[PDB]
UniProtKB/Swiss-Prot annotation:
Keywords: Acetylation, Cytoplasm, Isomerase, Membrane, Rotamase, Sarcoplasmic reticulum
Annotated source species: Homo sapiens
SUPFAM superfamilies: FKBP-like (SSF54534)
Enzyme superclass (EC): isomerase
Task performed by this protein: Keeps in an inactive conformation TGFBR1, the TGF-beta type I serine/threonine kinase receptor, preventing TGF-beta receptor activation in absence of ligand. Recruits SMAD7 to ACVR1B which prevents the association of SMAD2 and SMAD3 with the activin receptor complex, thereby blocking the activin signal. May modulate the RYR1 calcium channel activity. PPIases accelerate the folding of proteins. It catalyzes the cis-trans isomerization of proline imidic peptide bonds in oligopeptides.
Matches recorded under Gene3D superfamilies: 3.10.50.40
UniProt note on regulation of activity: Inhibited by both FK506 and rapamycin.
Organism superkingdom: Eukaryota
Protein name: Peptidyl-prolyl cis-trans isomerase FKBP1A
Length: 108
């Protein structure tokens, strides 16, 4: 599987990220058992990335592109769209399905 997008709160339903735009998000990343491994909210600073530059995992590139500005959504990402067989030693185990809570604050 790739990435599944499940809404949490609606956005404007009209403005979706296009290639080359900078997405400003707050996010929380959890393992499939619910353990949080990363969160911009615990740092109290939104996370910015440019769509299409592969600065984020493939599940983020294709999942966040489906969100409208203002939307909060749950992204469930299989390992192929994620850290794969190798994972990230000590943070993300092998073959890990990840769950992200993502809020698209604005586009820059």
């Amino acid at each position: 599987m790739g990435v599944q997008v499940e809404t949490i709160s609606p956005g404007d339903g009209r403005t979706f990220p296009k290639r080359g735009q900078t997405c400003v998000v707050h996010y929380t990343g959890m393992l499939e058992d619910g353990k949080k491994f990363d969160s911009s909210r615990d740092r109290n600073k939104p996370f910015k990335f440019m769509l299409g530059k592969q600065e984020v995992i493939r599940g983020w590139e294709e999942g966040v592109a489906q969100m409208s500005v203002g939307q909060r959504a749950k992204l469930t990402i299989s390992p192929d769209y994620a850290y794969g067989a190798t994972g990230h030693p000590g943070i993300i185990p092998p073959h890990a399905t990840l769950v992200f809570d993502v809020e698209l604050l604005k586009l820059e």
